[PDB]
Structure formats: C-alpha cells, structure tokens
Design a protein around this ligand. Structure first.
Ligand SMILES: Cc1cc2nc3c(=O)[nH]c(=O)nc-3n(C[C@H](O)[C@H](O)[C@H](O)COP(=O)(O)O)c2cc1C
Ligand SMILES: Cc1cc2nc3c(=O)[nH]c(=O)nc-3n(C[C@H](O)[C@H](O)[C@H](O)COP(=O)(O)O)c2cc1C
Lengths: 217, 217
C-alpha cells in the first residue's frame, strides 16, 4: 500500500503482543531511521536509547510507574523501546563532530567550503544559544521532527508503535545517567506488534477538517 | 521503493525547477499528510498555509527577502510551499473542537467516554499551560513532529522538499495576520522537483555514526 494508506491506517498502539519480536533485519531498519532523520543545520542534537533486553525495557518502564501505568505496560510488552533524547546545550565540540563527519563523507570540495558551512551552522546555533537563549527548545524541536519521521517509517515497515510523553523524564534521565552525559529524555516509542487488547487498532482515526486547519493561497 | 530506501535517498533540495508542478493527485496527497500527522493527545495545535499561486508564494518569500536569499529563491521556485504554524496558546475552545470531531468520527460509545477523554486531554494540556507555562513550546514540538512526518511522506510520493527555519517569522506572521488568528509560523517547506542547480542532489548523506548517537540496552 502507498504512503497515504500508511498515513491513514497507522495508529497509536495501546497494547503490544509480548510474544512478537522485530526480526534482526527490522532492528537494523529502525536504527537506520533514527540515524538518518534530517535536523536543522544537520545538528543531529540527539541520543537514542534502544532497549531490546527484558532488563533494558524494565529500566525504561520505571519512568512510567505509578502516575503513567497504562504507558508502563506498553514499554514492558513491546519488542524494542526507543528513548528519544535531546542534548541539554549546543556546544562547539558537537558542531565540530558533525562537520568532521560531513568532511569524512566528502561533502566539502575545499577547506574553504567546510569553513563556510561551519560558519553558517554557528550563525543559526548562536541565534539560539546567545540571542534567544532557547537552544534547549530548538534541539528538542529537532528531536520531535525525528519522532515524526520515525512513526511514519515504522508504520511503512509494517510495525506498530506509540509515541509516549506520559513518563517521568527526571526518573528516566537518572536511570541512564543522561544529565551527566549531556542529554534529557523527551519521547519514548515502544515498537512491535499490537495484541488483541489494542482497543485503538479498530477505532476510527479522527482529525480536524482542512477548512479549519489549512489555508490555500 | 521500501521506506528505508526513501529515507536514505531523500535530501534537502537546494534549488527547485519552477516549471515542474505537483499533479492534482499530489496536491491532495500532501494536504492529507499535513492533516493526519499524529500529535500529543490528538491536540493538532497547528495551521498550514499551502501557497501554490505565484502571488501566494511571493507573499511567503517576503519572509526570506534580504537576510535569507537562497531560502527566498527555494520558496519562489518550488511548486507548493507549506508554512507550518503552531497555536500561540492552548485554549479550551480548540480542545472542544478536537473532542467534538473525535465524537463526530465515532471514537466514543457514550457521552461518558467523551467527557472522560476530554478530562484526560485537559490533564496533559494543564501540565503545560498551568504548571510548566510551556504550552507554546509544547505545541511547537507537535508541529515539528508533523514536519518530520511530512518530509518522509513527500519523499515517499516521489517529491523533492526542503525544511526551512531560515526566514523572518515576524514578517511571515504579519503577511498572513497569523498572530491575531492565534498562530505563529515555525517552518516553511517548499515542495516540488529539484533543478540542475541542486548541488545537494548529487552529494552523499552525512550522519554521525550509531556508535556515538545510539546505545542498545
Ligand atoms: C528544522 C529544519 C530547518 C531547516 N532549515 C533549513 C534552511 O533554512 N535552509 C536550508 O537550506 N536547509 C534547511 N534544512 C535542511 C538541513 O540542513 C538538512 O535537513 C540536514 O543538513 C540533513 O540533510 P538532508 O535533509 O539532506 O538529509 C533544515 C532542516 C530542518 C530539519
Ligand atoms: C508527542 C506525542 C506524545 C504522545 N504520548 C502518548 C502517551 O503518553 N500515551 C498514549 O497512549 N499515546 C500517546 N500519544 C499518541 C496520541 O494520543 C496520538 O498520536 C493521537 O491521538 C493521534 O492518534 P494516532 O496516533 O492513532 O493517529 C502521543 C502522541 C504524540 C504525537
């Protein structure tokens, strides 16, 4: 089926079949999607935790215990659980890693082109770090864009998923020592195959009409 | 084209062929993708401007005149230009439109299920607009998730696109009267077909290795 079929038919999975696992092929495919997301200035201001062990999933699921138990079971029963993390600050060392990797990949003909690109990336980075002091929000936005890309990609692979904001980020950060590493957890996405308990697999999709949300000019 | 091939072969178009237009089918398909993006609590806190006339695109392109000239040319040369807008405040009238639509689309068996889901959505909204005072940032994150969905989607339709943060949002908001309508422009995505001047169509994609960005547990 075409990508519009995928967009109309994917859903937020509310219950996962704990017997059904990604193939080793699908495990590699979902990591490719995470890696190859676009981002502003190719800043890639992100870390992914991909929990596939029973222990790893249980460690992520701690973030949902008590106040978010419906979300806790999705993290325990899915095959693979992705934690989307943003960097907590945009530093020149990260931007150097990115330009060096672009240089390794051969995107710069001359040291002058490499310098020009670094200069331009820094201009955008400084609008956030220095002028607006919103660089943490700007990086977080790029991570959400990756989630958007990710949810559509895993649906087109024929996999079930659910994006989760209902979790305790302080608990999840502490569990994986993310603050010390320069990251903060934003979104958790369990990936797998829905079970018969997934009420949402058969509910109609609901969106506002285009005559409310979309202007043509 | 499997979706991993789409993810690995899509690119940020640096120049559009102004003679190559979306087909009528494609023009409807890109609007479906905008509408059916997921969002936290199905909040859909967004407006889209789709500019396809010369006059409409020129009005968008004013936001990039002067200090973003490359971006200006992309907006003038693409077939269709999408302005992604966030709501500036999460109000109870928008939450009522959303739950009334979910009710009209058949997601609720009883008035009780509807009130229950309305109160659940209000708990989340209130965390942002009452506790954290970050509903503007929260809604802007949902719009960036829509953008991530959209860029992979249009690539799967065989269309070229580039996401643009390099514009003046104050000029664009003024040009369409967005502030008074309760919205702000976040990202501009020209859609169409790349030209011969698109140097980025023949460069390999560059991303940080998984051994930096990705921990398996
Ligand atoms: C939020 C966002 C804003 C962007 N803004 C611009 C822009 O103003 N101009 C531009 O030429 N490219 C822009 N890009 C494209 C990025 O530089 C590009 O996504 C990144 O280098 C990765 O390359 P790819 O998209 O070709 O995979 C933007 C990308 C994102 C995700
Ligand atoms: C950013 C984000 C966070 C979400 N958090 C949760 C969550 O904590 N629990 C949950 O069951 N669903 C969650 N969802 C799923 C949304 O309710 C869902 O995307 C929305 O109702 C649209 O329905 P669909 O995803 O089935 O198309 C989240 C979705 C988004 C986009």
């Amino acid at each position: 089926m075409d990508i519009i079929s995928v967009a109309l038919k994917r859903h937020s999975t509310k219950a996962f079949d704990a017997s059904k696992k990604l193939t080793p092929e699908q495990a590699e495919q979902i990591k490719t999607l995470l890696q190859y997301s676009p981002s502003s200035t190719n800043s890639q201001p992100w870390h992914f935790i991909v929990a596939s062990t029973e222990e790893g999933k249980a460690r992520v699921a701690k973030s949902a215990a008590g106040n978010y138990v419906a979300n806790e079971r999705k993290m325990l029963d899915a095959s693979h659980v992705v934690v989307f993390c943003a960097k907590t600050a945009m530093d020149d060392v990260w931007l150097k890693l990115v330009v060096d990797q672009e240089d390794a990949d051969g995107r710069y003909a001359t040291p002058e082109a490499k310098a020009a690109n670094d200069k331009g990336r820094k201009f955008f980075a400084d609008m956030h770090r220095k002028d607006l002091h919103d660089d943490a929000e700007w990086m977080a936005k790029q991570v959400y864009l990756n989630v958007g890309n990710f949810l559509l990609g895993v649906a087109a692979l024929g996999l079930d998923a659910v994006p989760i904001e209902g979790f305790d980020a302080a608990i999840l950060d502490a569990e994986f020592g993310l603050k010390e590493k320069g990251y903060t957890s934003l979104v958790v996405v369990p990936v797998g195959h829905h079970s018969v308990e997934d009420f949402n697999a058969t509910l109609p999709k609901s969106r506002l009409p285009q005559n409310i949300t979309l202007t043509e000019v």
